[PDB]
Every structure is written in C-alpha cells, then in structure tokens.
Design an enzyme around this catalytic site. Structure first.
Site, mmCIF file in Angstrom:
data_model
loop_
_atom_site.group_PDB
_atom_site.id
_atom_site.type_symbol
_atom_site.label_atom_id
_atom_site.label_comp_id
_atom_site.label_asym_id
_atom_site.label_seq_id
_atom_site.Cartn_x
_atom_site.Cartn_y
_atom_site.Cartn_z
ATOM 1 C CG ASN A 160 -7.979 -4.512 1.965
ATOM 2 O OD1 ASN A 160 -7.362 -3.598 2.159
ATOM 3 N ND2 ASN A 160 -7.624 -5.744 2.011
ATOM 4 C CB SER B 122 -16.255 -8.654 -10.287
ATOM 5 O OG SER B 122 -17.563 -7.789 -10.263
ATOM 6 C CG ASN C 113 -19.501 -0.639 -0.323
ATOM 7 O OD1 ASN C 113 -19.723 0.412 -0.492
ATOM 8 N ND2 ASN C 113 -20.200 -1.688 -0.731
ATOM 9 C CG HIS D 291 -2.182 -1.023 1.063
ATOM 10 N ND1 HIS D 291 -3.373 -1.060 1.014
ATOM 11 C CD2 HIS D 291 -1.801 -2.401 1.430
ATOM 12 C CE1 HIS D 291 -3.949 -2.177 0.718
ATOM 13 N NE2 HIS D 291 -2.968 -2.993 1.134
ATOM 14 C CE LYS E 240 -22.729 -2.390 1.542
ATOM 15 N NZ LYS E 240 -23.765 -3.382 1.338
ATOM 16 C CG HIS F 99 -25.766 -8.806 3.534
ATOM 17 N ND1 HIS F 99 -25.703 -7.865 2.558
ATOM 18 C CD2 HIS F 99 -24.613 -8.507 4.549
ATOM 19 C CE1 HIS F 99 -24.584 -7.435 2.707
ATOM 20 N NE2 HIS F 99 -24.001 -7.862 3.728
#
Ligand code: HEM
Lengths: 497, 497, 497, 497
Positions: free
Chosen positions: D144, D197, D209, D71, D233, D301
């Site tokens: 992250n 993705s 997020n 990082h 989020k 969830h």
C-alpha cells in the site's frame, strides 16, 4: 506387457540419464517437503502458512470439468488427411486444393449415451468426429458410425437423449423410456434396425465406418453449388463382437476401445479410412422421391455412387488424455470456404448447439485451448476480453469495425451461396413422412436370414422389459415396416413373457 | 416389475384424473408446438425467432455439472436419527440433547475411485456420509465402510487418488500406479488387508458398517473434553458378494446398489444402523501405545468398548436424483457445539478441502441448495452478494461487524475448547511410524484360514499385473506384516507368472 | 436527513424491542467469536481449524459477479401496470385482457456505456427496461429513453459498444474511436442529434420518456396481425440538467439517479408513465416511404397517432440492491401470446443475445432467481439438471416428449403468426438507406434556434478531441443533413482549434 | 495530442506499408461480410446459419469477468528491479543474489474502495503491488501507499470493506457505515490520520511511497532468521492534490492516474522507487514496546534505520490492458526461498484469501495466464487437469508422489524456518492493545500546524454526514489520541451542524 501398460516405464526410459526436476508450487517456488504438513509439534493442528498443502489441495479440488452432455466416454487419436482424387470441380476448399496435400487431423471416437467410466463394448451408436486443421481455419466433420439418425427434427433431440439416459428419480436405465419414445416416434425404425443389427457393437473403433450423415453443400470457384454426403469407410474391414463376447468384455475391460486404439497406434499398425462422397444436383434434389435433407434417409448407391477423395490415417496417440481428448471441441459450424450447410433441420440445430455447450463445458475462450486452436491459420477479428484469455488479446489493434486504422477487413470471396426458398415461415410437420420404405429395403435386401433372426432376438431381448402397451406399439411399427419383422419380434416377446 | 422399474407408471397413477399441465418456456410463456421448428417453408433453413428451440437446447447444453473428484458414483436416501441412550455427560450437542429426539438425516453411499456410470459391485472403499439437520446447524459425519484409511498425512491424498484412478496418457486403470504407491507407502497395509478381505465388495449399501474413522472431540456443558470414534454398524448384518458374483453383476446391473436401496425403501423394508461411540480421555490419549489420532490405527474393543447412542433409519427415497443426491454437499467442518476436530492431520486437511471443492462443483452459494440448507436452523451473518443468490440476501440488514444497529451478535457459549500444544511449528515425519502391529493382529486373530487364503488370492490376482520390482516391494511389506501372509502371496504370484 | 441516508436507523427502528439474532456460519452453526482468529498463543500463526474465518473469507472472495457488458450502472424499482383502455381488438395478451387489470412490474434504469461506479449525470442513452409478471409468463419490454438507436444491423452492435467504451491499450475514453465509428456509419445522425440535444442528460429517471424503439407484432384472438410501437411518456414531465449542473453533480453525487428514485419512492411521490402505442397495418407497412422496421426511423404522430393503453406506477424500492437490481435479467425474447417479433434485424439479434449473456453473467438457472421467476405463472417442461438448481427440478416427471405418462402437453392456441417472405436468403446492404430526412425534420421543425445552438456546441465540444480527417467526415455528414447544422459545428470546431 | 490519445494512429503508423489482415471467425474461417446479417430477403427474419453473427455476439456476451472485490479500479506498468546493495547476510533470495542483478517486475496501482469506472483522484488508500519474476518462482510484494492498515485482525477485513463500500439497500456511499465501524474500532486512528492528511490524495501513482506494511522473515544461507519491513519510496518526490483540484479532476478526468502513468512511460520519463528494508532481530522483537507484528504500528526510523537494497524502474506500458492489468494476480503466499511469513495475523489471513479469490475471478488455472506465469522458472509437480488448461498438462509424467519413475522430487534446501511458539491454541483479544501512542507521535511531531488544521477540516468534512452519537464516539477517540485533535474536529463539526 502391451505398450499401453508400459506407459510409466517408457516415460522413465525416454528420460533416463537426467536427474529428477525440482518439485515446485504453481508459482514456481521450490517445495521443501511434500510428504508432511506443518503442525504445532508432532501431534498439533495444521497451520494456514502451509501454502504448499493448500495450493496442491485447491488444484486437486478443481480437477473435474463437466462431461459432454452426450458422447462423454471417448477415445482420441491424431494423424493426417491425404487427398488422392481431384474434386475441385465440386468444391473450392483448401483441404481439397491439390492431390497429395496432407492436412493434420484430430479424431475422437465415443459412445453416445455412455457416461465417463461406462463400458465401451455396448449396443449404442458410435461417434466419429474429425477435426481438419485447414489453412482456411478448422473443419469439424462431426459424424457417426451410421449414415442416418433416429429423428429428423432437432427440437426432439433433448427428449431422445433424456429417454436413452437414466430415469430422473431412480437414476437407472429405463427400457420403458427408450421404447415409449421409439414407439411414439416411428421415423426411428431405420436407425433402430441398424443399431440392433450386427454393427450395433463394433469390434473397437478401427473396424467401423464413418458418415457425416447430413447433406452438405459443395461450392466450386465458379460459384455453382451441389449437395454432398461424406463417407469414410474402414480399410481394416467391418468386424463386430457377439452379444456374449461384448457382455464378457464389459466386465473384463470397460476401456476396450481406448486400449485397442492405443496399442494399434503404439505398435505401428496405423488404422486408415477411405474418404468418399456422393453428389446430388439441385434438379436431382427437387426430383428425389424422398426429402434429400431427411437425416433418417440414405442416398442409394446405384443412383448415387461413391466418389473417392482421399484417406484418413491415425498415427499419433495423445500425450495427455485430458489436454488433447477431454478438452477437444468439434463445432459443425466450423466449415471452410467451399463447404456450407444444407436445409437439413438437424444440421441447422447443430450449428447453434455445439458452440453454446463448448462455452459452458470448456469456457468462453475454448478456441485458445491448443487442440481447439486453428494453428495452421491466422485469426484476426474484433472479438476481445473474456475469462481465461491466454493470447496477447490481439494487442492494441482497433476493436471496432468499420474503422480508419487498417484493422482486419472482410474478404468478399468468402461470401455464402445465395438461394431462394419458397413457402411460409412457420412450423411444418415431418412426423407423417415415409418411415418404412428404406427400412424394408435394408431388411429384405441387405440382411440375410440368420442376420434377420439375430436382429429380431436383439430387439426382443431389449424390448421385453417395456410395458405390454409399449411392446404392442413397437411391434405394430415393426409390422408396418414388414410383417415377418413384426411377427418374429412378437413370437420372441411372447416366449420371453 | 420391481418398484424401481414402475417409476413412470406410478407417477401417472398418482396424477390420474387431472389434465396434463401447459408446456411453457423457462419464462412461463405457453409453447404453441415443441415437435417442429420454424423454417422458411417445408425445406427451408431454421429461424432465429424460434425462441422455444434455442431456450430448450441452451438449457440441454448446460445440464452437466462437474462430478465429485472422488466418490462420483453414488446412491442417496433420507430418514432420521433417533437417540436411544444419554451421552449428555460427554457432549452438549442438541442432536444428543434428550432420549427419543428425532433429527432428519440425508445419507449418500458411494464408491471412492469409480466415475459416474462405473460398475457398483467392484473392490473399493464404500463412502457412508450422513448429514444431520440439527437445530444448531447441519452436522456432516462424512464416513467410510472401514474404520481406517490408507494414509495418515493429507498432503499424500491427491497422490493416492491419482494412483487409484486412470493413467494420464492412456486413460486406463494402472495396477503399476496403484501398487507402486502402496509399496512405497507401507502405512496402507492395514486398509489394503481390509480392502482385499471379504468386506471389500459388500452386498449393496444396507449390508455394510459405517465409521467416522477420525478421532473427534466431545465437549460437555461443564467444559470437559474427551476423544471419540463414531461407529454405525448395520442392523441387516454384514453380507458380501463373491468375486464371481460381483464380476457377473458388473455387466448385469452396474447400478446394483442404487436399485437395491430404492427397492428396499420402496417396499417398506427400511434399513437401519445402530450408532455407537468409543470414548478416550486425555490421559488415556497421552498413554496410548500408538498415536490415537493416527487414521491407519483403530481403538481395540477390549480397551475401548462401544457405547450405544441411537439408530439411523432410512425411510424416504429421493424424488429427483440430480436435485437431492448429485447436488448434496457434505462438509466435515460442519460440526455443531459439543463436537470439535482432534489433532488428526487427515481431519485437519478435510476441514479446508470440502468447502473449497463445493464452491467449484456446485457454486459459491451451494448452501442455498435445498438439500444443503440448514432448514431446521436460522442463518444470520455478514456474508452477502455472490453468483446465483436465491434468498432475500438478508434484505437491508447492516453488512459489517461490529455495528450499532442490532445486527446479528456472536454467542459466547459457542466458543471452541482451548488446549496447549508443545513442540516446534514444522513438518514432522510420520512415514516411519508402526505399520504392521494391528495388521498382524487383524490377520492372525480376526481372519480364519479360508478367509486368509481368499485375502491372499485377491491381492495376488490384482498385484500380478504390476512390474516384478513392485511385486517384490509389496510382498516384502506383506512379509514384514507376517511371513505366512508374504509367502502365500509370493507363491500365488509365482503361479500367476 | 433524507430517507436514503437513514436506511440503517430505519432498519434498527423497525426491528426495535427484539434481541439481536445469533451469528451463525453458512451451515447455521452458532459462532463463538467473530472478532479474533485462532492462533498458537497471543503472537502465533493462524490455525486451519478456524472454520469461521475461512468460511467468511471464502464467501467474501466470491461476492463479485460479472457486470452487464452494457448498462452496467443502473437503478431499480417495482410497482404495477394498470390497463386504462381496451386494445383487445389489436392483441389477445392477458396483460391487456380487461380494463383495471393490475400486473406487477420490475423496472431498471441505466446508462448504456457507464461501468459500475461511473457518474450518473453524463451524456448517454438511458436504458428503461420493464418486466411485466403476466399470467402467461414474464413480458420484458427492454426499452430506451430514445425512440431510435444509432445502427440498423445487429452485427455492428459489438463494434459500436467497443467504440463507445475504453481504448484496449490505454483503458481511456477515446473520442477518436467514437467519432470514427459515427462518421463511418452515417445512419447514426438521427440518434446523435437526439443524444447531443437537451434530452441527452435527463434530470434523474423520473423526468424521461421510455420507448420500445422496435416495431412489434400484435395478434388478436381472431388471428389478425398488426405492427406496434410502445411509448411510455413521463407524467412528471421532461426535465433536463445543463452541462454545467451535470458536470457539478458528476463529482458531488455520482449516484444522483439512484438517490433521486429512492427518495421519490420513500417519501410517497410515486413516479408514473402513461403507456401509448402506435398501430401500423400490413398494407401501410408495404406503402411506408421508409423501412417501417428500420430502428433509426420513427412513425410520425400525424400519420400514426398515439393510442393510450394504461399507466406504469413505481411504488416499491428494492429491499436488497444485489438480489433485486444487479441480478434482474430482461429477455426481449420473453413475449406472451398476442405479442411477437417483427422483421426488424436489430430485434432479431436481441432475441439471441440476451439469454446467452444471462447464462454467462448470472448462470444457467438464472430464471430460478426470485426477481427473474415468472411467479404469477406455472412453469412445466422437459428442461432438467443444471448448475445451482433451487427447485424440485420438476420431481419425478417424465423428462422426454412425446411420452405416454401425462407429462406437460403443448397448447395449440399459443402458435406463432405465419407470414410469407419474398427474396433470396443472403446478406442485404442497409448502410446506403435514407439517413438525413427525419434528422432534417427533427432539426428544423422540433428544435428552436437556441436549442439548435446548444446542440451544435455540445457536438463541437465532444468532437474537437477527434483527428482533423474524422472532424471533416463528421461535419460532412452533418452538412448533408442540413447546411446550417454542418456550418455551425464547423465554425465552433475552428474556434476550438 | 499526448501519446495516450494517439494510440490508434501510432498502431496504424507502426503497421503502415502492409495490407489489412483477413477478418476470420474464432476458428480461423475467413468472413465473407461482417456489416450485414443473413435475412429471408431485404425485410426478412435473421437465419440461424448466420454463424459469423452468433459467434461474434456470443463472444461479446462473455467479455466481462468479475472485478476484484477490492482494488477494482487500477493502473498497470512493467519494468525491472536492480540490486544496488548486498543484503545476502539477511536473505538467501535469488532476487538479492548479487549486485547489478535485474529481475523483471509487473506493477499494479489501484484505489481500494473504488469500482471499475470510479474517479481516480479521491481520498482512499492506494494499492502498490509488485510481481518479481525471480528464478525461484514469482515474488508478489502486495503493498500500500501507507506503512500501516486500519485493523490488526483479518476476520474484520470483510466488515471493514463492506463499511467502506455501498449500502446494501440504497446502493449509496454511507458515511454512517464508515464512521460507525471506525468509531467502534479505535485501532484505525493511526491509518485514519494518515488517510485524512495531505497524502490521502496523491498526485498520480509516481508521487507516492510504497510499503509491504507487514513484518516479513528473511532467512540467510546459514539458516539464521530476522524480521523485515519493505519500503519503496518515490524518486520523483511526494506530491499531493488539494481537495479542490482533486474534486475538479474527478469530473474532468476520472482516469487521471492511468493517463499520467501512460504518458510518463510513453514520453520516456521512467518513474523509479528506491527499495529499503528495516531489520529486527528476534531478541529486539521480544523486547519491542509494542507488538512488532501489529499492522497498525510502524518501526521508528531512529531505532530501525532504512537499509538500501535496490531500485524499481517502470519502463514498459501494457500492450493490452485486459490481458496484462485486469487479469494480473498478486499472491502474498508467492514468496521465494529466503523470504517467509511472520506471525502477523493479517498476513496469515492474506496467505489464504488471495489464491481463493483468484480461482473465482480468473479461474482454477489462472497461473497459466501469461502475466501470472513464472516464465523465468520451471514448474514441475503432480497438479493436473482443470478447466481451461493451456499447457501440455505436464504430458505423460507420473501424477502421484512418491513414485519409482523419476518424477519431480522435493528439494530439501527449500524447507521453512522452524520456531517454537508458546501459549494455548485459542482466540486472543487484540482490540484493547495500544491505539493512540504512535498516532499522537505522528500528530505532534510529523505534522505542522497548517497540516493539523487541514487534517481536522478533512475529517470534519467527511464525518459531518454521520449521526450525532457516531460523531461523539469518533471525536472521543480523537480526544483520547490528543485533546487539541479532538477539540478542533468537534469545533468544526459544531460549525457544520
Ligand atoms: C443488436 C442490438 C442489441 C444487442 C446485441 C444488445 C445486447 C445487450 C446485452 C448483451 C445486454 C446486457 C444484458 C445483461 O447482461 O444483463 C443489453 C442490455 C440492455 N439493452 Fe441491449 N442490445 C441491443 C439493442 C438494444 C436496444 C435497441 C435497446 C433499447 C431500445 C436496448 C436496451 C438495453 C437495456 C435497457 C439493457 C439493460 C437491461 C437491464 O436493465 O438489465 N438494447 N443489451
């Protein structure tokens, strides 16, 4: 008990009537318990999630910084410099602006060759460094208890210090190394005579003189330049330990000078030094019998009388020794407008050596350390990012010069004094310069008979350990200084053998 | 003179009949002259193009590394470990493979609380660290001259060392700090009794025992595990200095142990220690009256007799002290297959503390330093790039695991010994454990009457400087050990006051 | 695939038919398992006794050293320097002793302003540093792909680099900063013209020239001195990328130069440069129309033709990039006998700057790093102890000079060449020197019409982002160089706005 | 222009109507001239007494500190955390005391594998670290942009990072290394699917997020403990760049995220994130189908709904990037009372790794750096002396514990939550755990058909560079996840070949 011994009880007494602070980690998280470690039951292995343990231990593992390559063992004190006389005709320095002006100072006393934890009361040159917090930045007068040094060329300094310190194989003090170097370098006879006199082992730091030792250059507002030598002589008077008393104190209290200075300041008996200068004009410098920039020579008082300037008083003891005394850095290059360097080769070497070693020892941003900060002045420049930066890093100001955004501009009144130098650019030999004249003067004018005898017994006592040929070469140099000096040492050496 | 004093003459004699080497810079460029500096004529300022000067000086400015946070003052020697007995039933270690196997060793002796340049002959625990260069990597037995320590929880170690060392304000030794800590922590009574006995000031490093002090775990080839204590007792016999002789030597020769070890090895009188072990089974550990992993307890010889293993002989002196003794690093975590850690909390703390401090002191790649390298083993792993890397950095080998390119693979035979531990994961108090039983045993069985008197006078002599309440708390702990012990100290303290 | 992509497969193939090495710790202890960590059961916390984990992780945590303050992004290669012509009349250097002499070299290519991980194919001066491993120590020719630089005084270098690099608040590239500095410093017009020409973005490192850029001093065996400029022109021919191709490669392969050099050397196509010199006598230097030591000026080929010396061939790729390319240090101060510095102020600044930054970046003993070691020469001196010392530390040799024990002696034949310099010692202004003559010559003689158009569009494309007043000040400087140059840029800027 | 470009003009405008500050040295001495250097006449060599030059240059030489091992490339911003909901039943943290409580925060966004100067808009996990300045010390939520990670054992982290970064010989990105590691470690399939993705390349830092990713332990005032996952989020909504747009921005603006965040905060459009938690009881943890502490798994969830806590708003840009963003240190070990670690092996590894690397990168006293200081809390402890100490060093307070002088005492209410763990202390294998269930769920429930196609083309585009056997091993793992997933990748790879 003495104030030094009652440090913890005094801390408790000054913080009486308030509850103990909360024990926290470095990150300020309150510690639940710091007497036991987290284990898998009563007789289980230690857990990694013991963050309190690993933080404490990791910080403990990184406590030591490198000791000073020289003047490691030291004692620190704070106070002020008060101007008593007007020398504005000589220098335009803000430290010497007007009479009665008080500049805060930081002082560090030290033994040149001693490591951290060595005995205080030993025969060695004493360091006497003074940091003036002037409005035109810090002024560091990094001086000794002697007006001269052993050598006159800075390339021999690492050699000299290596000879004075331990043997590279055995890790022992080697009189063989010390006297080989001194016998091969006969320009050390003057400083050797001073070192083995009575003032070799001063009684603490309050009973010794201080000298800049170098020729400095004073520039006035009109732009005229002269040469200077700084003297700061003790107001408590010169006082020395006998060899026997010094030998006793070495085992009794190896921290004699630290205890003496702490108790003196704690009880209210503030020690003071009177600041003197000698002045030498450029015509006088050209017509001086010796090299006036030679560090092994002095300016005789009859020809160059002392001119009073002010007094140095030490009134405050360090709160924390590591923060204020271990981490203090003195740069001879730190000179305000009105004070400049002379062509003295030794001083020229010191201009490079100190900032370089400070970046190693303390770190790149060592001037951000509170004791090193020029807190009575404003720093603004195009020096940015380094390790351990604890400022705003001059925020969002342009970091290049010249620029068109009103960033800090150079002050043309702070220019250096220009001088024309003659001769080729090469290495000039100074080993063959006069080495005996001022040494003879000191021996036969300043010292009396019993002082001459003690001087000879002290030299003979140290030199007896060296090899025969080194003893002969040393005695030859002492004989060339004065035949009685050489003959007395030789007689004592023959007795010792 | 002694061999130590004749180091330079011996260097000259061994290099006689060859011309002196060419003086070069760091980069190997021949130096024209290193006695004078380049100036603008005879009395001109120094030039920047004096590359020889600035190189020499810059290297001189960076000579000091940080001293060890503890055991700073030290003496180093080299030799071998010879196996004399078969303990293969206990351990599968390559160091103990077969009888007559010689493993090279590096040893460092030290004083725990003394700084670099402090006196050798002082009352303090002596460090006795041994580095075995085994075929299965280095084994570091980092031991003391005492079978126990002052504390039993590693979170108190930084506190203990801070109390033993200088006051943070005054920078002086504080008996107030020492005895406050010892009086508040009564598990130190055993080690205090040992320290203030005759063996507090051993006559050099050749006349003292060595102990691992921790319980270790020996694993055999079959996979059975036992508990161990390492003893290495002197073959020259225990020999101690009187307080008066020690006080004399402190001023006479502060490097007494370095000189003694150098002269002993130089003259051919190689000192030797006999390597012993005690064995404790898991059922014996569960049925031990005390905690067998408690660092303040010993295993009695009647219940657990010494089993001979081999002998440690020191035959080679260091060539260069800085390279071989100052830069040597001992990691208790460095244990070959067959030797493992026990649940001893102190040992668990040492597993973290040492590699962490070594990365600070020496640097990230401190294991590339020749004295620290496991030169009798092959290192291959996925540890790459760091500061000051002086290897091929394992060339172009894959630097991730697992991989599909034949990079170093884990050896399943080198797995640790698994054990089931009971109880919760939290902080368990051990301050309230037995503190007086073995101390009483030592006092009234081992010591005779004149030894008990000397012990009491030594404690009273040190403790007299502490405040009255600290003296009372200390004497109370000594009284709880044994009433005669407490009463004799109290009588001497009353005399001193 | 290309040889660069098949590094791991080639490693596996060259080490086929042997079993994988044993995975060990740093201390050489065999690792049981390095895929799982020790926990208190399957879902338990991690243990401290996981020595394998903490060792691996601790080494991982200390992998990064500081990047070079400039020329961070770089590519490294090795080979030799072959002498083809006799220049012994000019220099007495062992590198130029006899014809056909091969000296091993280490080369590093770089982009000045780019950080580690920045794109290779960008408009920036390319570094071309060469390290000659001469028998008289290392020779570091630290050159550029341009015969000149932007500035002529070394005190402006930190300012220039700060302007070229990111904004201190936003951390973004600031054309405002770049063009403000360049517009305020009109001595950069020559280097700016070169930078925004076609040779601003060379096609890899094999298709660019190399220049010492400084005036150097060659001394022969007789003691006569001349002035020199080193040229090393590509044998593969000059070849450049278009702005569009460079912009494409910036996203496609940011490591274009590293891949190109690796593949070129791996496939056998060894790149070569022909080593040339220009010679200038002291009378020619005094009668030169410009300052011959001015870094913004060149020596015209008609007056000072190129004299061939030898060729530079790169045949070996680095085994490990970090060990051989990241840790390589080039000191312009590293010059063997026969090569010396000239009065060029910039070169004088570089003599200090490089060794200082190397001690910070790599460490005090950076010359012990294998790539930095003068392995074809013998180093012997009185430089001892520093952090991370991986030599015998010159064993037990005397560590002071002069001495009487046959320690390394100075070689009088390696003295510097003496010269008499006139004028005062002060700060002389060089900002007002000629800034346009050679720039005009380059513009209207060397460049053709389409090259002049591309140059103007490249400058206008970069300068459009700056504020209006900065654009006016820049265009004014371009107009003072040549009216067509200024007018064309202004027309393009007006189009852009 | 945008606010980012007008930094210097805004600096000038805010400091209009005052004269430029005096240019000084580090020591506050006014600089006479900083455009020229002191020479021996107009064409003379540089002098050593040029203290201004050597100071400036020496500071310039020490600007670079080591980049973060991971990082490295990052963007920083400041603001506050506002509590909107009561979770006092779960945690007793002062950060969650009462509703409407504002805690100042420092945030740093980053790319995991990118070096300093690499492109922002690339396919890589984004770092999202938050530093809460709580009254009970700092809280560092180091998160992250993904709720999971690639691996589940911390001993593989150095291996993973080495595979993601450059080849050790060629210094190039190696898809061979990346896909070999990922194919050998099939627990990375979940994170790989997320990474390839659409959310692999988020449009700046405001449209992503943030997740703690670890299971944490919340403890209430009553002493009951639960398990937690932190979610933050975006309130600006998820927004991603296409591969073509990202590829364009990589060459156009490699500092896209820094510019976007600076402009967003400068214009007043303050970005905000809504702070959520999931709660898991100890019985639910024991009856969870997977390992609830597995970092490669999520909590669904439907079973574990999000519970709102507060919102994170960033309103202030950094004044100086180096001081506030480069030097900021986030320690996951920094957790206030009420928040603790879970048995998650990865989190256990992070507890050690971060403070260790911070001591290397920044220095031992990195918590004295203003951005790292817990300024809203009082630090008092027995941690003393280290390099670069810029505090009073806690003055003259006793530096040992326990003591009898009212030094900081442990707070018994800040004890850790005790838990009984079952099983042996050894290395448990977790490579053979479930690797495909949640990956299949994500693939066939969350992603639609065109998202599945883009995912497959992105993986195939990156994986085509790997060797045939690595492609087969990767496709096999994708087939075991889902046959359509594997078959589509294989079809695209066959097309590419
Ligand atoms: C006053 C002028 C200059 C100063 C103060 C200066 C300073 C520096 C510094 C501090 C470095 C970093 C070295 C390191 O840390 O490894 C460096 C690198 C470099 N400089 Fe300069 N420099 C100057 C002029 C020049 C000139 C005129 C050239 C070429 C003609 C040049 C070529 C280079 C090259 C090629 C490197 C990279 C060396 C490598 O490959 O590692 N510099 N410079």
């Amino acid at each position: 008990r003495d104030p030094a011994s009652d440090q913890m009880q005094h801390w408790k007494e000054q913080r009486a009537a308030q509850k103990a602070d909360v024990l926290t980690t470095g990150a300020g998280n309150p510690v639940g318990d710091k007497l036991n470690v987290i284990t898998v039951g009563p007789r289980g292995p230690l857990l990694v999630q013991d963050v309190v343990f690993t933080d404490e231990m990791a910080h403990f593992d990184r406590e030591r910084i490198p000791e000073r390559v020289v003047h490691a063992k030291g004692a620190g004190a704070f106070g002020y410099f008060e101007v008593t006389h007007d020398i504005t005709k000589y220098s335009k320095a803000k430290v010497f602006e007007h009479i009665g002006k008080k500049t805060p100072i930081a002082v560090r006393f030290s033994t040149v060759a001693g490591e951290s934890g060595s005995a205080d009361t030993v025969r060695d040159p004493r360091g006497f460094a003074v940091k003036f917090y002037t409005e035109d930045g810090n002024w560091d007068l990094v001086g000794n208890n002697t007006p001269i040094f052993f050598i006159r060329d800075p390339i021999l300094f690492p050699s000299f210090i290596h000879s004075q310190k331990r043997n590279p194989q055995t890790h022992l003090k080697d009189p063989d190394m010390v006297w080989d170097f001194w016998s091969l370098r006969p320009e050390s006879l003057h400083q050797v005579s001073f070192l083995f006199s009575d003032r070799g082992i001063p009684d603490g730091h309050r009973h010794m003189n201080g000298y800049g030792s170098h020729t400095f250059k004073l520039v006035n507002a009109n732009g005229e330049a002269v040469y200077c030598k700084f003297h700061y002589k003790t107001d408590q008077g010169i006082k020395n330990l006998s060899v026997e008393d010094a030998a006793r104190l070495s085992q009794e209290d190896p921290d004699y000078g630290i205890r003496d200075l702490f108790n003196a300041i704690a009880t209210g008996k503030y020690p003071s030094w009177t600041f003197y200068i000698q002045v030498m004009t450029f015509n006088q410098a050209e017509t001086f019998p010796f090299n006036p920039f030679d560090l092994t020579k002095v300016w005789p008082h009859k020809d160059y009388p002392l001119i009073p300037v002010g007094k140095l008083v030490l009134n405050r003891n360090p709160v924390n020794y590591f923060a204020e005394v271990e981490q203090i850095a003195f740069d001879p290059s730190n000179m305000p407008p009105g004070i400049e360097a002379s062509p003295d080769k030794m001083l020229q070497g010191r201009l490079f050596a100190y900032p370089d070693t400070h970046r190693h020892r303390l770190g790149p941003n060592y001037l951000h350390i509170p004791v090193n900060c020029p807190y009575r002045a404003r720093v603004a420049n195009y020096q940015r990012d380094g390790p351990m930066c604890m400022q705003d890093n001059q925020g969002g100001a342009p970091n290049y010069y010249p620029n068109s955004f009103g960033a800090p501009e150079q002050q043309p009144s702070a220019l250096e004094h220009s001088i024309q130098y003659s001769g080729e650019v090469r290495r000039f030999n100074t080993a063959n310069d006069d080495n005996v004249t001022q040494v003879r003067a000191f021996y036969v004018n300043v010292l009396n008979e019993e002082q001459r005898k003690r001087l000879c017994e002290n030299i003979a006592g140290h030199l007896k350990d060296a090899q025969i040929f080194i003893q002969k070469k040393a005695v030859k140099n002492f004989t060339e200084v004065h035949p009685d000096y050489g003959s007395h040492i030789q007689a004592l050496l023959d007795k010792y053998n």
